Structure 1
Amino acid sequence: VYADSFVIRGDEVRQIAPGQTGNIADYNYKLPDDFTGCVIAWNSNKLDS
């Protein structure tokens, strides 16, 4: 099992899913096409912002 954590913009969360092309999904962190598992995200403006 693997757990990875980081913070991104609100509009780039959709980019996390495998397959999509863009800035964050091609230059920083991306998943393989046959990835198994899933992602979880939630708002943290009360803490980080």
Structure 2
Amino acid sequence: VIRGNEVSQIAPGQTGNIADYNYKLPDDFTGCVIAWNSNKLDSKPSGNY
């Protein structure tokens, strides 16, 4: 699970804080990236931490 703006960072060759320190993709990566909104299940009014 990541932020809305960080979906671009889940790609080969992207510089992102999550890209450098959390999940790294190889340059020659083959496969598919799937991103969908999870506001209904992965959010809380008080703050889901």
> Which residue of 26, 31, 36 maps to 1:37?
31
Pairwise CA distance, 1:38: 1.2
**Alpha-carbon RMSD:** 0.6
Report the count of equivalent residues. 42
Give the TM-score of the pair, scaled to structure 1: 0.80
| Unpaired stretches in structure 1, ≥5 consecutive residues | 1-6
Q: 2: distance between equivalents of 1:45 and 1:21?
A: 26
Pairwise CA distance, 1:23: 0.3
Structure showing greater radius of gyration is 2
| Unpaired stretches in structure 2, ≥5 consecutive residues | 43-49
Give the TM-score of the pair, scaled to structure 2: 0.80
Q: Deviations over 1:15-47 (max 9, x none)?
A: 001101120100011110000101101011011
